[PDB]
């Protein structure tokens, strides 16, 4: 008894959905291609500005990363595997040890060539700067500390240095290894990019065996006590993840199952902590009461390395490392909880760690460790392949070898929340919210006003992500008194370079 | 130089890609669910703030639109067709005739309830305001002129007024009808939403015949000269599109093919055009009619303000108080067209479908019962003619005929949403205008009673653009000037809208 008189028509029937879904991606591509030809700035205008930027990159030997680098390295291997149509405009992202001087020089070149408006601005990502020509984004310039910068491996195509795919793979693994913050917006795209990257640039196979020097007998026993006793403390199990070679041996052991030459001697323990200061204090104290001579215990602190690691420590006995701790506060780290109670990092996490550790050994010119990490990567891929084959399972499964794991330990916050809180901190500190360089404004000024700007540019310092040992006491996160006791420095100042 | 000869291993085999692709959507959902339980603000905190907003919407009778409205109206019809699960967070969007007073009242309620930080901010799209509680977006408040607002049809669910799906359909058609600017970011999602909308709220079937009064014999001949002569001028063919009932008769004619009923053909009450060179067209058309008419002193122009987000400025060129032709402003849009062998253009099928919807809504606001039923019948006839045509031709919804959907061919100069938005910001900056209006209750209640009352008065001195769709009665607001000699010129005037 609602309303009987109503008649309706069927606009879409069953089968129409599938037809549109299949046809839409190509229609959308054609609409994008057409738009590029008739809308200001046109593809013809875009190409001319892009060639100027490319000339600067070529001249300076700057290292291109992101989509453009992945598209070019893939196209070199197989043109049918490209991510860009190369009619459909994309901005160029490049690394630089001097991003603000580069930003000015490139903005000046475009200004003197008759382009207006031309502006270089600070991007959303701090330490990244963007160039806009006629309100259109053309390139991103990212700071890389000099030492790290020269160590980035590239493939030269048409005179341009493109970041090696296996360096770029670290960034896709970083997204996969942040399940609570990156899954929603990055995982589908990260998998797509990783898949085509590895298809064209596959995992290497190494035949060699690892050459790790067995530590001094006392060191070996101290290492053993970190795993057998320190990793038993409930507060430690809930805030720490076993990483490095001990996590690597765990994955090898699971692949053997006993039904062996891949297993390595442990040079030192390596942990990742989400309560960094708390862990370092408790670990230093633990070693102080297990060791023969407590006065022979030292701590070496290291600055973060690029975008790859946080602050770290090396707790040494008689100048020999026992254990290394890495800061992960603010991240929810992917874990594997064992029946023993202790946690290991996930498979994709240890894979990323081996990649970062191999890159660090390459920066340190440590030939022995560079080849050892390379072999560990090869062995980890092999152990995983053998395991999935043996158990007849997919890449996503219910074992320790599963990919796209969401289980993690540690408090975290969304990228959006963190970004808004960072803006509030900048606003409170009376600091510049967004830096802007306009060559029109610059060259209209008097030579005194121009020199006042050129000095201001030189007084800017970036965070210290060199990975170097901390030598300035005011930059150290931990204090060791004359009685050898650990305390956190409450009045620690942010360290800058250069 | 020289690529090395190395050994490689497998990482992804056939068909690991497919396995990941299928499993990822659910893994991502679980990562999002977990994140909402452990990350600040939690789903529990979000639900409490959302209930306060919903209480305000319910008390004020505000009309909800977008995703929330579509999800709720669909669920009412069939719960298995939900566009998203209501466990997870989604922001709410609602229409208002007083969006700034509503924004203040709702921000004040949340402030007095103990929430901090609380801010109401101007959104990226002008006339829309956003509420942020603890750095999280909760709702969007969009301005709708009073007369238009009361005319929006709703479905009441749990005390909340949700915009009728067939009003919301106009907005999805708007996206489809902007191929060069909306294809990339909106078309796939717009199709998905339209499909589920029409499945649950189908196109109606009307049996009735249209009752359009045949114009006076002279008007009929004048109407004919607009089509037979005016539409043949090459600059007119390249800047105008035939719309209204003449474009409707074109689609009916194609459906029947002259050898989809013959009784579907209507008498033309007046010509209706859409121009991408609006002022140029109106001037030329007024001049054309001045020539062809007996007694040019009987020619008048009635101007109309834009209607909501649906139409631009319009004119009605009348003879002896009788309309001959109506012109609609579309400058800045690339309008989807059908170019005939004759040279003149019609709007596309999905374009005329949207026009009939807008025209029916306008007739509803004007309380023009005759035209309201006429446009309703034209919609029913247009869906029927298309269905009959595709059925006989045995073709998909995307085809090479005049009845094809997702057409990319269009006429007129356009620019990206991003470029337009940046140019608008520059204009606001030059004019010394507020770039982004922000209301912070904390700051307000901390201010003196004079400062607080200075703000309350500012909130009354603010004028939105006149999008009432009313006839312009103030001479200073008219876009076209008619002198004592009856000649047309474009009016200068910078500011005023009522």
Residue numbers in the entry:
A (entry chain B): 4 to 262, 278 to 516
B (entry chain A): 4 to 262, 276 to 514
What does the paper say about this structure?
We verified that the Mimivirus and M. chilensis predicted PAPs were able to perform polyadenylation. These proteins were not only active, but also intrinsically self-processive, generating >700 nucleotides long polyA tails. To elucidate the molecular basis of this processivity we determined the Mimivirus and M. chilensis PAP crystallographic 3D structures, which revealed two topologically identical subdomains with a nucleotidyltransferase fold. Thus, while other PAPs form heterodimers with processivity factors, the Mimivirus and M. chilensis PAP become processive upon homodimerization.
Since they shared the same characteristic features, we will refer to the highest resolution structure of Mg561. As observed in solution (see later), the Mg561 crystal structure reveals a very stable homodimer with an almost perfect two-fold symmetry axis (179°) and a 3200 Å2 buried surface area upon dimerization. The dimer structure highlights a large tunnel at the interface between the two monomers. The N-terminal domain (D1) encompasses an extended strand followed by a long helix (α1) bent at the P28 residue. In each monomer, this helix creates a domain swap, and makes contact with the D4 loop located between α13 and β16 and the α7 helix of the D2 domains of the other monomer to form the dimer structure. The third domain (D3) of the Mg561 structure surprisingly mimics the catalytic domain topology leading to an internal symmetry between the D2 and D3 domains (rotation of 162°, 2.4 Å translation and Cα-rmsd > 2.0 Å). Two of the three catalytic residues (F286, E288, K342) are replaced by non-canonical residues in D3, and an even longer insertion within the helix-turn motif (37 amino-acids) of the NT-like subdomain is present. The interaction with the D3 domain is stabilized by a conserved disulfide bridge (C350-C426) connecting the beginning of the β14 strand and the β16 strand in the D4 domain. Electrostatic potential calculations highlight intensely positively charged grooves on each side of the entrance of the central tunnel, which is contributed mostly by the positively charged D4 domains and to a lesser extent by the D2, D3 domains. RNAs could therefore interact with the PAP through the positively charged grooves and reach the catalytic site through the 10 Å diameter wide central tunnel making the two catalytic sites accessible for a ssRNA molecule.
